[PDB]
């Protein structure tokens, strides 16, 4: 159906308007995703630092406790 | 505005619409994964 | 073709500029993802 | 002659083929980008889990060492 399945100039224009809108919304959504990904990155960096510091606190407590014990079982 | 021009523009414009349907689903998936990123340091 | 080729020209041009904008955001996204790989190492 | 800032039919079709090319490129890049998102999510999950497990290991080690210290202090 060549007549039906072929767009008029006005329908082509309408389609162009719609693709523009979809592409703009796409662009803006990706900007927001990048902002949020940068946030997730700082969060994960801060978190891993906190974890390392807590791990160290515990290694140190454990070593001190193991030592206080020996320094009396003697 | 010739027949050939309108037929070729129509084909192209329909193809662009198809591809963008695929793109926006890709974006939807991106959004989902990003949402899950916010839960990694929780529990 | 009067102002329908005029109108179509502007429509096509804007679409091209907008898709270019999407590519830049995608490029930034890929850069952030590279740094995420760096985080685990 | 056609005006400079207005596409001829031939130029309009050329510009349409360029959009198809660019859009297709975008789609494939997006698929790649989402594969990367998923790969990073998987790596970060594994990584955060490892650090929790390592914190917990030293926390338990410290706790038991202190308990041992107290019970054997008498």
Numbering used by the authors:
A (entry chain A), D (entry chain B): 29 to 102
B (entry chain C): 678 to 720
C (entry chain D): 679 to 719
Paper text:
OPTN is an ubiquitin-binding autophagy receptor, which is initially found to participate in the xenophagy and aggrephagy processes, and more recently is also demonstrated to involve in the PARKIN-dependent mitophagy. The N-terminal coiled-coil region of OPTN is responsible for its interaction with TANK-binding kinase 1 (TBK1), which is a noncanonical IκB kinase family member involved in innate immunity and autophagy. Here we biochemically and structurally characterize the interaction between OPTN and TBK1, and demonstrate that the direct association of OPTN N-terminal coiled-coil domain (NTD) with TBK1 CTD domain is responsible for the OPTN/TBK1 complex formation. The structures of OPTN NTD in complex with TBK1 CTD and the related NAP1/TBK1 complex solved in this study not only elucidate the detailed molecular mechanism underlying the OPTN and TBK1 interaction but also uncover a general interaction mode governing TBK1's binding to all of its currently identified binding adaptor proteins.
Fortunately, using this short OPTN fragment in complex with TBK1 CTD, we obtained high-quality crystals that diffracted to 2.05 Å resolution. In the final refined structural model, each asymmetric unit contains one OPTN(26–103)/TBK1 CTD complex molecule, which has a 2:2 stoichiometry and forms a symmetrical hetero-tetramer consisting of a OPTN dimer and two TBK1 CTD molecules. The OPTN(26–103)/TBK1 CTD complex adopts an overall elongated and atypical parallel four-helix bundle architecture. In the complex structure, the two OPTN molecules mainly form two crescent-shaped continuous α-helices with their C-terminal parts (residues 73–102) directly packing with each other to form a homo-dimeric interface and N-terminal parts head-to-head bridging across two TBK1 CTD molecules, each of which also adopts an α-helical configuration. Notably, the extreme C-terminal 11 amino acids (residues 719–729) of TBK1 CTD could not be traced in the complex structure, presumably due to the dynamic nature of this region. The binding interface between OPTN and TBK1 is within the N-terminal four-helix bundle core, whose interior is formed by 10 layers of interacting amino-acid side chains. Detailed structural analyses revealed that the assemblies of the 10 layers are mainly mediated by hydrophobic and polar interactions. In the complex structure, the C-terminal coiled-coil region (residues 73–102) of OPTN consists of four heptad repeats, and is responsible for the OPTN dimer formation. In the OPTN(26–103)/TBK1 CTD complex structure, the OPTN E50 residue is exposed to the solvent and plays an adjuvant role for the OPTN/TBK1 interaction by forming a charge–charge interaction with the positively charged TBK1 K694 residue, which is further neutralized by two nearby negatively charged OPTN E46 and TBK1 E698 residues.
